[PDB]
Amino acid sequence: QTNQFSKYWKEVDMKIKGLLDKLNKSSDNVKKKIEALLVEYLHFNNVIGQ
């Protein structure tokens, strides 16, 4: 309704990069969990971009 897609697009992108930096410093157990959340976050960002 408010059409502020860029504001939430940037918040999700900041969360994506935050999870990207935590991914390289992550143990093997939580690493698959982080990858599983990045694929979902890419879906959220792809929808907002479209």
CSV table of C-alpha atoms in Angstrom, one decimal:
chain,number,residue,atom,x,y,z
A,1,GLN,CA,0.0,0.0,0.0
A,2,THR,CA,2.6,2.5,0.9
A,3,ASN,CA,4.9,1.5,-2.0
A,4,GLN,CA,8.2,1.8,-0.1
A,5,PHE,CA,9.8,-1.3,-1.6
A,6,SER,CA,13.3,0.1,-1.6
A,7,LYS,CA,13.3,0.6,2.2
A,8,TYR,CA,12.5,-3.0,3.0
A,9,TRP,CA,14.6,-4.2,0.1
A,10,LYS,CA,17.6,-2.6,1.7
A,11,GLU,CA,16.7,-4.0,5.2
A,12,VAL,CA,16.5,-7.5,3.8
A,13,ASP,CA,19.8,-7.0,1.8
A,14,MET,CA,21.4,-5.9,5.0
A,15,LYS,CA,20.2,-9.0,6.7
A,16,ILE,CA,21.5,-11.1,3.8
A,17,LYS,CA,25.0,-9.7,4.1
A,18,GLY,CA,24.8,-10.1,7.9
A,19,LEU,CA,24.1,-13.8,7.4
A,20,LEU,CA,26.7,-14.0,4.7
A,21,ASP,CA,29.4,-12.8,7.0
A,22,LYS,CA,28.2,-15.1,9.8
A,23,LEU,CA,28.3,-18.0,7.3
A,24,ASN,CA,32.0,-17.9,6.7
A,25,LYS,CA,32.6,-17.9,10.5
A,26,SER,CA,30.1,-20.7,11.2
A,27,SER,CA,30.5,-24.3,12.4
A,28,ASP,CA,29.4,-27.2,10.2
A,29,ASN,CA,26.2,-27.8,12.2
A,30,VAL,CA,24.8,-24.3,11.8
A,31,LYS,CA,26.2,-23.8,8.3
A,32,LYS,CA,23.5,-25.8,6.6
A,33,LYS,CA,20.9,-23.8,8.6
A,34,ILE,CA,22.4,-20.6,7.5
A,35,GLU,CA,22.4,-21.7,3.8
A,36,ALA,CA,18.8,-22.8,4.2
A,37,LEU,CA,17.9,-19.3,5.4
A,38,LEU,CA,19.8,-17.6,2.6
A,39,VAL,CA,17.9,-19.4,-0.1
A,40,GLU,CA,14.7,-18.1,1.5
A,41,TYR,CA,16.0,-14.6,1.9
A,42,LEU,CA,16.9,-14.6,-1.8
A,43,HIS,CA,13.4,-15.5,-2.5
A,44,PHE,CA,12.1,-12.6,-0.4
A,45,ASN,CA,14.5,-10.2,-2.1
A,46,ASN,CA,13.6,-11.5,-5.5
A,47,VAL,CA,9.9,-11.0,-4.9
A,48,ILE,CA,10.5,-7.4,-3.6
A,49,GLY,CA,12.7,-6.6,-6.6
A,50,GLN,CA,10.0,-7.8,-9.0
